[PDB]
Design a protein around this ligand. Structure first.
Ligand SMILES: [Mg+2]
Ligand SMILES: [Mg+2]
Ligand SMILES: [Mg+2]
Ligand SMILES: [Mg+2]
Ligand SMILES: [Mg+2]
Ligand SMILES: [Mg+2]
Ligand SMILES: [Mg+2]
Ligand SMILES: [Mg+2]
Ligand SMILES: [Mg+2]
Ligand SMILES: [Mg+2]
Ligand SMILES: [Mg+2]
Ligand SMILES: [Mg+2]
Ligand SMILES: [Mg+2]
Ligand SMILES: [Mg+2]
Ligand SMILES: [Mg+2]
Ligand SMILES: [Mg+2]
Ligand SMILES: [Mg+2]
Ligand SMILES: [Mg+2]
Ligand SMILES: [Mg+2]
Ligand SMILES: [Mg+2]
Ligand SMILES: [Mg+2]
Ligand SMILES: [Mg+2]
Ligand SMILES: [Mg+2]
Ligand SMILES: [Mg+2]
Ligand SMILES: [Mg+2]
Ligand SMILES: [Mg+2]
Ligand SMILES: [Mg+2]
Ligand SMILES: [Mg+2]
Ligand SMILES: [Mg+2]
Ligand SMILES: [Mg+2]
Ligand SMILES: [Mg+2]
Ligand SMILES: [Mg+2]
Ligand SMILES: [Mg+2]
Lengths: 141, 180, 59, 56, 25
RNA sequence: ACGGGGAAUCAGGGUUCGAUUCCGGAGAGGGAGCCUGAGAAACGGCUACCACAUCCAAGGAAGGCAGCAGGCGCGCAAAUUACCCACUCCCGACCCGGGGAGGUAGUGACGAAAAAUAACAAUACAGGACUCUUUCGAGGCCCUGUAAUUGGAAUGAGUCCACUUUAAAUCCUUUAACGAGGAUCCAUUGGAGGGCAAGUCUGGUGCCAGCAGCCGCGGUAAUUCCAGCUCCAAUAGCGUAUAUUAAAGUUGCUGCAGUUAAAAAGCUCGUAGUUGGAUCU
């Protein structure tokens, strides 16, 4: 059982922080290795240069080709695979063009079918992908 | 450094469960019955009632002879009686916990304008208020969410600069009379 | 209704002594200089670069 | 895999123009209609409570 | 609706089971 | 990691944030050393060295925006090279001069408050309740709506005189004149299998394209994709990414667990620590 005496505050506090270090989320947030290894560097979004268009096999129970792009982040040069969400949207992207990339939705964890992919393209050449998809804006020339 | 103030509040809170049949139906009933624009007005009234209930609950746990309890309980009861939500014969603190949202919704200028017969519907009442046809005492009131004080209720008129009260025809009457 | 403030002075000379200049200008009893803040500031900083009498020779 | 099929289905979908329609009420008046549709005059009841979009 | 009970009982574990159960309650 | 006053969330206990307008501290590209002064180790003072960098007639000279604007760069990420000392106050020899302190506008969906996008009458009815009659009917009391059916009323969004505002203006408020039937003066953003509110309607595709936070949907009859129609959630706002809080009694002081789900040291001794039997009016 736990100590319960009136003079046990230091024991309780020290035990709580030591055991707190055994929590996955707490250790991830406070250890500093996760932030160092994060390609975004703790940012919500990032900007990168499209290196090549790639097709990724969907996971086994469902068969499909997910259209992604290899991007090189400007701020640190790290290379990333980012998912281009809607259909035909890969045709809006060219080679060696500016792209704004965001997270995929689960804090650096792969989402759904696409394996080892945790980023999605938000902007292509400073115009939103949604606007291009819905015909609100056209690709700048 | 500037000479500005930054005190501000949120007047409503949002429900934790966004989609549930009972809450949605009850809110829609209130909106339709009192001619409200959206659910934010319902949540605003709910928030004021919740703050009042929280203050009353804080006061109840105090001692009956505690001067703070006496002072702020008297103030709260007098504020609630003054706007017409509470009855003077029910001026005990616990009765505050018996108040409902419809009591606060009935004291709006929109519903009172409808009840006094100045308008033939709650929506007609809202458009009458927003169109500067309604005055309270001598001040033309433009805000539907104007909680009418109990003493101020007897002075709600048609705003004698308006066509319905002051007999000056508006744009449409003037144009249609020029066509003759 | 409208609400404002008013002053009635015992004499016009007292008003000219005690009133703020812009309120006198509203009545036409005062006129402001036509220079700008930038004009005066640049003239001052130019005059700061010259010695005694030549200060009056720059404008 | 191959990226040649990238806008296939959206490309082959036949275009259908949106029909012209009246404007929908906004604000208090829209909420009024909804209140009238859901709470004012609903007499029929056969123990089913068909949804607002019961196509079948 | 009795049709809901029938469509659920035909395939208690199927593409439409969850919707029909939600309708039943 | 500048510290506090404080902020977000929160039943109770807590967790997280606090560069940021108030108080205190530090610094003026990096160190160091000083003059003057009541008060600096002052940088919109000076003297050097280090790093940058300006003009040069090549001998020399001059630098310090983490002040206000503004530019570059960095980036996911942030406004005008505007007007004024009229207000608040400060400085001076001073009732008088000065103040990018400060005030006023500009940009501004950070965020917070209020709040339009229609109301009514008549018809005609899906119509319904209410009502007598015997079924029709009658019931013309009350309500709702296809109403591209009618009808006049009311308005501010705009345009725009004049005041008022103000240092001068702008805005708001006040008032002339004009200003609404698709009142086209036309609300959007997300969804419609479950979680979770709302279509196993129609057309296209056919494990493709894609959707899908999770479970899953798609392999020729797709309630899930691409669209039409319809529907619903919030609404002048609503999606998305990320940090964080509640949910988490999944850090457990309140208040968790350790036979088999993760878990009691192989066993005993033992310092510190923690805890420690009655009893005194
Ligand atoms: Mg630091
Ligand atoms: Mg801190
Ligand atoms: Mg700070
Ligand atoms: Mg910092
Ligand atoms: Mg300070
Ligand atoms: Mg210093
Ligand atoms: Mg610098
Ligand atoms: Mg120094
Ligand atoms: Mg400087
Ligand atoms: Mg200084
Ligand atoms: Mg600057
Ligand atoms: Mg840039
Ligand atoms: Mg910003
Ligand atoms: Mg001044
Ligand atoms: Mg002065
Ligand atoms: Mg300033
Ligand atoms: Mg402007
Ligand atoms: Mg936003
Ligand atoms: Mg707001
Ligand atoms: Mg106006
Ligand atoms: Mg839609
Ligand atoms: Mg659809
Ligand atoms: Mg759902
Ligand atoms: Mg449902
Ligand atoms: Mg999604
Ligand atoms: Mg779905
Ligand atoms: Mg938490
Ligand atoms: Mg809890
Ligand atoms: Mg557990
Ligand atoms: Mg085990
Ligand atoms: Mg053992
Ligand atoms: Mg011991
Ligand atoms: Mg003892």
């Amino acid at each position: 059982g736990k100590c319960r005496g009136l003079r046990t505050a230091r024991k309780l506090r020290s035990h709580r922080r030591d055991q707190k270090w055994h929590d996955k989320q707490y250790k991830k947030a406070h250890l500093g290795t996760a932030l160092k290894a994060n390609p975004f560097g703790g940012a919500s979004h990032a900007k990168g240069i499209v290196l090549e268009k790639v097709g990724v096999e969907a996971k086994q129970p469902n068969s499909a080709i997910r259209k992604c792009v290899r991007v090189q982040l400007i701020k640190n040069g790290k290379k990333i695979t980012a998912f281009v969400p809607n259909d035909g949207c890969l045709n809006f992207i060219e080679e060696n063009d500016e792209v704004l990339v965001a997270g995929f939705g689960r804090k650096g964890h792969a989402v759904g079918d696409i394996p080892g992919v945790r980023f999605k393209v938000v902007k292509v050449a400073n115009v939103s992908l949604l606007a291009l998809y819905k015909g609100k804006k056209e690709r700048p020339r | 450094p500037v000479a500005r103030s930054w005190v501000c509040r949120k007047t409503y809170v949002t429900p934790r469960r966004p989609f549930e049949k009972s809450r949605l139906d009850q809110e829609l009933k209130l909106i339709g019955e009192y001619g409200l624009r959206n659910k934010r007005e319902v949540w605003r009234v709910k928030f004021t009632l919740a703050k009042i209930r929280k203050a009353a609950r804080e006061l109840l746990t105090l001692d009956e002879k505690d001067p703070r309890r006496l002072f702020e309980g008297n103030a709260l009861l007098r504020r609630l009686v003054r706007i017409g939500v509470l009855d003077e014969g029910k001026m005990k603190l616990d009765y505050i916990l018996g108040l409902k949202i419809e009591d606060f919704l009935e004291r709006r200028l929109q519903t009172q304008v409808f009840k006094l017969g100045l308008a033939k519907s709650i929506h007609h009442a809202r458009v009458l208020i927003r169109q500067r046809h309604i005055r309270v005492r001598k001040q033309v009131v433009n805000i539907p969410s104007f909680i009418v004080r109990l003493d101020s209720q007897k002075h709600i008129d048609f705003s004698l600069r308006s066509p319905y009260g002051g007999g000056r025809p508006g744009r449409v009457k003037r144009k249609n009379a020029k066509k003759g | 209704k409208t609400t404002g403030f008013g002053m009635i002075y015992d004499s016009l000379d007292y008003a000219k002594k005690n009133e703020p200049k812009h309120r006198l200008a509203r009545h036409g009893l005062y006129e402001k200089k036509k220079t700008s803040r930038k004009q005066r500031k640049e003239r001052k900083n130019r005059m700061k670069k010259v010695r005694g009498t030549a200060k009056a020779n720059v404008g | 895999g191959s990226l040649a099929r990238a806008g296939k289905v959206r490309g082959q979908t036949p275009k259908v123009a949106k029909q012209e329609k009246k404007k929908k009420k906004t604000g208090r008046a829209k909420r009024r209609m909804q209140y009238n549709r859901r709470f004012v005059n609903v007499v029929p009841t056969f123990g089913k409570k068909k949804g607002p979009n019961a196509n079948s | 609706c009795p049709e809901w009970m029938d469509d659920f009982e035909a395939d208690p574990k199927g593409k439409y089971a969850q919707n029909l159960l939600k309708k039943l309650i």
